[PDB]
Every structure is written in structure tokens, then in C-alpha cells.
Amino acid sequence: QTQEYTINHTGGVLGDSYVTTASNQTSPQRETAVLSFECPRKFEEINYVGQRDATRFVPRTTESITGSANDDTVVDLTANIQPVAGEEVIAEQDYPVAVAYNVTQGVEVDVVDADYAADTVTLGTNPADGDEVKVWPIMSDGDVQFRLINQFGQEEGRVYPWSTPLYRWHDFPQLKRGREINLHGSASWSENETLEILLDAPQALTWEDSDYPRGQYVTTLEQDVEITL
């Protein structure tokens, strides 16, 4: 009867219809709904348990600059920054804190290091004047949470009262049992009822850019659940 699956921000067991993504909002700090999963017709019910079900959620943002004659090799940012689980070094991390891509030169761009104290990052390359650039740094200073919807956009409850910060979420090394993250709360729902994963943070996150090298979908969520067939 019961199984233990993973569910992702796209498709998976659902089929890309009863998922929906969305960005947050910047100027009004508000508890937006960045993702939501609706139980399809075919399942009987879905469960969700804390301290039983593992999780992963790698968000990012997007920013841009303008090429100049001066040898920049460094860019400021609008988002608080830190390393992935802490380290000054690049390529030792579980994943890159930041990625950069040049529109003109359709190539990746490495990263040397950064201050990780102020909103700063180094670039290893020397961008030319007029060249367009994009960057997908780490995100910080946010809160994440869950809530349930009974087919109508009509809340009935909340999985767990207190929000967990995405900041801390990045801080812990993920994907290690014993050190794996496990939120609290014990939810369950049935056909056409929705779980919404909600965000409260200033910086504008992303889901799709169509010019990001390390995979198509920039960010990701991967959550464990229990299903009754």
C-alpha cells in the first residue's frame, strides 16, 4: 500500500499540471506562495511527517551588470551572501554559491572567491565593455513555510507555526543523514487538495532562465513524502 517517494518542482509522479510555480514579491514584503502541489485524481491520499521525511531546497536569484572598460573582476550584490555551508574556497562546496554567464561569450564563468561579509563577489574573468552578463548568486534573509488548501483557495490550517529561515537552510550541509534537515508537523490531504510552499523574503528568486548552464531549472525542491498508492 504505502510507499516513500520524492517529489520535485516539476513533473515527477504528478505530471507537470498539478504543480505550479511562482516568484515572490519585492517591494511589499509578503508571504507569497512560490510553489504548490495539488493531489491528483488518481491517488488516494498523501501524508507528510516531520523527523521522518528528508528535504532539499536550493534557491537562487538573478542580477545583471553592464560591461565597462575598467577591469571590474568584482561585483556588488543586493542580497546577503555567505558560502555554501561555510568555506572561503570554491569547488569544495556541495554546489557553487554563485554562477555567472556572459551573453556575448556564450560560456560559463568561473569564480575565485568572495568576501562573504558584504554583498560582494569576485569574478575570475575580465569582462569586456558593453558585454551583457547574468549572475545567479545564493539567496539569503528569508523564511519558508507550509500551508494547506481545501480545493478553493481557502485555508484551513498550518503545518507548523514557526517559520524556518532559508539562511539556516543553506547553512546546514544537506543530504547527510543525522545532519539531514527534517522540519516539524504532520500533515495529510486527499484528492485535489493542495499544499502550498510559501516564501517571505525580499530578493527576487527564479525558477527558469533558459540561459543557465548547470541545468535548465535553476532552483530546485526535492521533498520526501508518503503516499497511499
Binding site: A85, G86, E87, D115, Y116, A117, A118, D141, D143, L148, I149, N150, E156, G157, R158, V159, Y160, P161, W162, T164, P165, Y167, R168, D171, F172, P173, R177, G178, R179, E180, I181, N182, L183, H184, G185, S186, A187, S188, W189, S190, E193
Partner: protein, 175 residues
């Protein structure tokens, strides 16, 4: 939809971005002030067990770690910013954490010494002793964390609404 009636003793953790916490910059040779202040919210009761993890991750304004001879002291207070000798916990040095793996590793995870409790209106302070001719603390980059949610290792901070339980007042008087 269905949600489980989670127990009142909720498992939580503390950090900078909360309402009932505050911080402010610090200079040098400067014990008396709380670099970080905590206060009990209204009609709640917080509980910190003896095996609770601890994790200060202070910084310098230029983005550096400070002199590891620096000292950190968590300390309970009576109301009115009035410290007390008994009930003190975590008199540690600022060095010997290895902030990279500190929370990450249960080895590096430095726990408290004795139990602790916070009645609805009480204070816990975090004093810092920096030797002179050193750089000061910068609140933008500093941080505290205590308790270990989201891990089979470590413990978590207990919280309960005072209005729910009847012996909440009994435990508050018990301290």
C-alpha cells in the same frame, strides 16, 4: 486537508531575525553590555535543556574572525537587566569552534553546561570580553544560534504557550 495536533512543547531555535531578540555593536575591553539581548515573549515559556547546542559566529566589520582569546558568556538575568551568578551557562572562549563545521559536526557542536528556563518576562544576555588593541564587533555580520532543530543530533529549544497548561505557572515559579 488534515494536520496533526502537534504537541504544545514545540521544538524551536533562536536566531537574529526574530522580534524578541536584539543586538548592538561592541568595541573592546567591554564586558558589561549584552552584545545580544533575548527576552521572553508574553504568555510563553521557553526551556533550554543542559545538552543544548550553542553557536556564536561573531565577526569583524571588515569580515574577519576576532582574537580567539576573546570570551563569550551567556548569562541569565533577573528582570531589569539584573544579572545573576547562579544559572549562568556557556562561559566559553571565542576561539576553538571551527565555524566552518561548528553546527555541522556533532563533535564541534559545543553544548551548554546546565539546564535553563525563561519565564514569560525574563532576560538572557550574551556578554563579550575582547582584549584591547583589537577590532570591534559588527552587528551586521555577527550572529547567534542556539538549539538544533532539523537534525537527529543536538537538542532543540522547547517552547509552550503559558495559557494552555495549568501547571505552567507552577513550572514558572519552579524556574
Amino acid at each position: 486537508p488534515e494536520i496533526g495536533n502537534n504537541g504544545a512543547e514545540k521544538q524551536i531555535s533562536l536566531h537574529k531575525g526574530q522580534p524578541f531578540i536584539d543586538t548592538q555593536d561592541v568595541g573592546a575591553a567591554d564586558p558589561n553590555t549584552p552584545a545580544v539581548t533575548i527576552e521572553g515573549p508574553s504568555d510563553y515559556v521557553i526551556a533550554i535543556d543542559a545538552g543544548t547546542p550553542v553557536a556564536p559566529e561573531f565577526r569583524d566589520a571588515n569580515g574577519d574572525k576576532l582574537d580567539p582569546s576573546t570570551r563569550v558568556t551567556i548569562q541569565k538575568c533577573d528582570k531589569q537587566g539584573n544579572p545573576l551568578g547562579d544559572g549562568i551557562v556557556f562561559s566559553d572562549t571565542l576561539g576553538r569552534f571551527e565555524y566552518s563545521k561548528m553546527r555541522s559536526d556533532p563533535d564541534y557542536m559545543r553544548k551548554t553546561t546546565t539546564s535553563l528556563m525563561i519565564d514569560e518576562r525574563e532576560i538572557v544576555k550574551i556578554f563579550v570580553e575582547v582584549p584591547p588593541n583589537a577590532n570591534g564587533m559588527d552587528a551586521d555580520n555577527s550572529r547567534i544560534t542556539i538549539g538544533d532543530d532539523t537534525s537527529d543530533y543536538g537538542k532543540a529549544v522547547g517552547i509552550v504557550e503559558h495559557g494552555d497548561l495549568s501547571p505552567a505557572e507552577s513550572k514558572a515559579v519552579r524556574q
